[PDB]
Design a protein around this ligand. Structure first.
Ligand SMILES: O=C(O)CCCCCCNC(=O)NC1CCCCC1
Ligand SMILES: O=C(O)CCCCCCNC(=O)NC1CCCCC1
Ligand SMILES: [Mg+2]
Ligand SMILES: [Mg+2]
Lengths: 547, 547
């Protein structure tokens, strides 16, 4: 019958419980047991700590007051304090040491995923310390995961007072009988129990989760490895930069730090990075997930030349120019991958670091024309099929839903065959009309791509495949160069078009090139293995792009 | 007859001329005169330097080659090199030492302001050094100031070759007879002169400008102190964050670094920061110039409560949340100023630093109601006039152009009288129908505000003045607090509504408060004194908000 889960912060979703430091500072400084705890609660309701918890005074105003309480509390047990005693020192250390109890957050997230209304009910303070940013960031991450965040210092209500509970019940629009309350402080449980709501005294996460699991009848403990945070398109910050007359690029922006520009491939969207955007951001980066020219909310001019690599790159440079960015780490996938490689080859000054997924850097053959080269590779047949304007457009557009359900599939789900399409007459010639639902995408997500492409269609996207002669000539100018800025190539085992083997000779043009490999990963890397990707990129950014 | 100005980079818009370092490294290292210069041009057209200048090889590939040339050039004059000789060492130092020759840039900008088509024609290289970002940033700033930037390493054409010149003439769509070419290298002047175009051998900036001034017949030297860079609305990056259902805030974003959120007052726009956005960005900040709720492209819901300070602040917090920002320096003006003060009082954790222009922080009088307080101040009469919904809306909306031309005026231009409006019956009762053109705003700019307000009107904006009772109560909760995070108050002498005197007791609630004062500055601070403002804020950010 439960339908709401409320989690305590310090001691439930965050550990080590700040305040739980008092006890340690005593056993450490060999002070009388509880001394610092009695000072922390000196005065009870009228106490400085309760005022601080209600929002009457800021943390910085409180610190001095708690110090006074550590002078009057010790004044009574004979006892004196160390020459270097500092409440700020003790708390700054305590707060930053406190981290998100991941297992609890996971339980929280799960419950939310199955219908529950989650909320954080905590006794906190207005933090104006010079290190406040620490708490801020931790709050930034947690917040987005709960429907509600009830902070005492914000409502002026602190709990064991039953009023904050009524407030909670009201904020939740739920009755006691259907609410679970997790807290590491017994007292704060009494008022909850009294209104008639399930309470869990949280000591060790696992036991609490055990009790929570039982009471909710939902698998929380020993649950499979969850998917990284995906982002809701409507909650994202959307940006629009006009890089040329009637050519504006749309992008999603999240987080702060070095600018990391993500460039999706064909036929995708900024949405194809729905998994790494929150991660890279959380990792300390300003993620700029693009809508490459031709897709979604970005301009999709009809002309082919508008999509030759040179014009595409210049625009990206202008994009940086307009945004007031001198550099950006360029991370591309598929056609996007190709784009970033040339960004590093023609605009190193603007690329802090470059990284590609699946797409390897392969210099142009000054002798053989692209068309010929590609004709010499069975798996690259479809590219010839995309040459004739209109042809590919018609089929890929006939049924958008079908197209994406047919494309976005894991290694072991294929329903197509990129080899022999010119012969078959089309990409879906012998593909089901109603393709099954891939394990990588939800019906909702596919529908996002469908709605995106309902704007500009596949002309713009397909044109990226119609400038090989031009790209070839352009690239030939870079044959004497070498990518010497930080570069990271990430191969996908199960990608049968952009095979890992195609990248083997890359160290020749990119000497310091770093690598990454993902097993059982198909072409749609980001979707297929978001966890490993985020892992691989975050590790690479922190080492070769942050400095 | 001239109509185009082309400036050389190294040695014309940038100094000290990199390469001009060779000569110094010789006299410094007591090397044979010219030794390093002969190595830098070892091979002429076929030389490593010419390949580097054409884009064939990157700078990092060149460095090794120039070193070889410093071994073979010294191999001939008997001579050997120091144990610690490094071409990278010499160049990294040279490039970063090179700075924008401001006087030249000013001449460039002026000419552009008077009809000329300006362009930078330079022999440069693809910079992939680990310090490349240096050049990048300098290029980022210059670029935006010229219609064209012709880089040799990008066109594969380097100059004294006459071809790059034809390219130039073509890029300019202008004939030789109407082009001026500034360069510190005689040789590069010959090809220009030969096509029949005015050339200026630039040695010392002033003499060159003297010659340029003469040949163009335009005052370039000893010109008045120019206005800071203003930004073109259509070239700005526009962002939209939905903070609540059917409530999305629009903002302009530029630059990278600590996030600095700018909050305009009544009745303005993000455009009111058109002067500090490029500056603060150039200063190393990520400027987020807002469109405060109720204005421009931001949502303007009809209800009054939607604009009480509490709701306004919560939304700003959500704005940060959505953008993945844990903190932001909040700089507000007028009503915006008020907003940031309360952001620091209720969300210190999110405010890296707070700064207000004109608007002082004055705690709520727990006894007297706002309405009464304001009735006790003649100059605050209009605020009572803004109370009745519809009233103020009708007048301010009757003639938008008139309204803004009537409002946006410097201290010595007033055409109104904020004292006695309830009596007069309106704000413009005895104001000209066709107000003159203020020295602060161009007809075009006023028209921007006019077009902005044609969307939501003055209801939303006016509502900011209709929640005093609510704001009062809210603020009373903060009476026991103190702004202890970095704060900077900036007063305006000639502001007769938000007078400097109203801020005198601010140190009481903001102990570490820093200040700034601008003379002969009216209420519309940003417009009135952009130079001093940018100066004051940049100085404050670099000291109290960067760390
Ligand atoms: O090989 C070459 O010489 C040039 C290659 C340019 C390659 C772009 C490669 N990416 C795709 O083709 N993705 C397809 C994967 C399958 C579904 C459609 C998009
Ligand atoms: O004084 C108080 O008690 C509360 C004050 C809230 C004040 C907002 C002040 N800013 C303006 O009024 N600007 C007007 C300047 C003149 C043109 C119209 C906007
Ligand atoms: Mg607790
Ligand atoms: Mg020169």
């Amino acid at each position: 019958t439960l339908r709401a889960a409320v989690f305590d912060l310090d001691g439930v979703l965050a550990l080590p419980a700040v305040f739980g430091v008092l006890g340690r500072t005593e056993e450490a400084l060999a002070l009388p047991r509880g001394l610092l705890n009695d000072a922390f609660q000196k005065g009870g309701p009228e106490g400085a700590t309760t005022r601080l918890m209600k929002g009457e005074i800021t943390l910085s105003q409180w610190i001095p007051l708690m110090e006074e309480n550590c002078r009057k509390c010790s004044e009574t047990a004979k006892v004196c304090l160390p020459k270097n005693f500092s409440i700020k020192e003790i708390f700054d250390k305590a707060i930053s040491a406190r981290k998100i109890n991941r297992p609890m957050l996971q339980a929280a997230l799960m419950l939310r995923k199955k219908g529950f209304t989650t909320a954080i009910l905590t006794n906190t303070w207005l933090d104006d310390r010079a290190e406040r940013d620490g708490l801020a960031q931790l709050m930034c991450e947690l917040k987005m995961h709960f429907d509600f965040l009830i902070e005492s210092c914000q409502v002026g209500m602190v709990k064991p007072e039953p009023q904050i509970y009524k407030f909670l019940l009201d904020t939740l629009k739920a009755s006691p009988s259907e609410v679970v309350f997790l807290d590491d402080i017994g007292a704060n449980l009494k008022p909850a129990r009294d209104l008639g709501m399930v309470t869990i005294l949280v000591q060790d996460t696992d036991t609490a989760l055990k009790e929570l699991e039982k009471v909710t009848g939902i698998q929380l403990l020993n649950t499979p490895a969850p998917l990284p945070t995906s982002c809701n398109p409507s909650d994202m910050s959307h940006g629009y930069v006009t890089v040329k007359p009637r050519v504006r690029l749309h992008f999603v922006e999240l987080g702060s730090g070095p600018a990391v520009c993500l460039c999706h491939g064909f036929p995708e969207s900024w949405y194809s990075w729905r998994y790494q955007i929150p991660a890279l951001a959380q990792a300390g980066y300003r993620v700029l997930a693009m809508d490459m020219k031709g897709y979604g909310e970005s301009s999709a001019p009809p002309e082919i030349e508008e999509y030759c690599m040179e014009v595409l790159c210049k625009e990206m440079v202008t994009f940086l120019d307009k945004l007031g960015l001198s550099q950006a780490v360029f991370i591309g996938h598929d056609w996007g991958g190709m784009l970033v490689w040339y960004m590093a080859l023609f605009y190193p000054e603007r690329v802090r670091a470059v990284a590609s997924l699946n797409t390897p850097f392969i210099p142009a053959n000054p002798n053989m024309s692209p068309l010929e080269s590609i004709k010499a590779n069975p798996v690259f047949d479809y590219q010839l099929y995309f040459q004739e304007p209109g042809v590919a457009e018609a089929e890929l557009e006939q049924n958008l839903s079908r197209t994406f359900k047919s494309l976005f599939r894991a290694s072991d789900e294929s329903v197509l065959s990129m080899h022999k399409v010119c012969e078959a007459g089309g990409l879906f010639v012998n593909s089901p009309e109603e393709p099954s639902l891939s394990r990588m995408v939800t019906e909702e997500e596919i529908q996002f791509y469908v709605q995106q492409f309902k704007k500009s269609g596949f002309r713009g996207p397909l044109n990226w495949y119609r400038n090989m002669e031009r790209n070839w000539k352009w690239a030939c100018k870079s044959l004497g160069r070498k990518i010497l800025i930080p570069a990271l190539m990430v191969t996908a085992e199960k990608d049968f078009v952009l095979v890992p083997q195609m990248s083997q000779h890359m160290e020749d043009w990119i000497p310091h090139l770093k690598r990454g490999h993902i097993e059982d990963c198909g072409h749609w890397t980001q979707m297929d293995k978001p966890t490993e990707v985020n892992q691989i990129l975050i590790k690479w950014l922190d080492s070769d792009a942050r400095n």
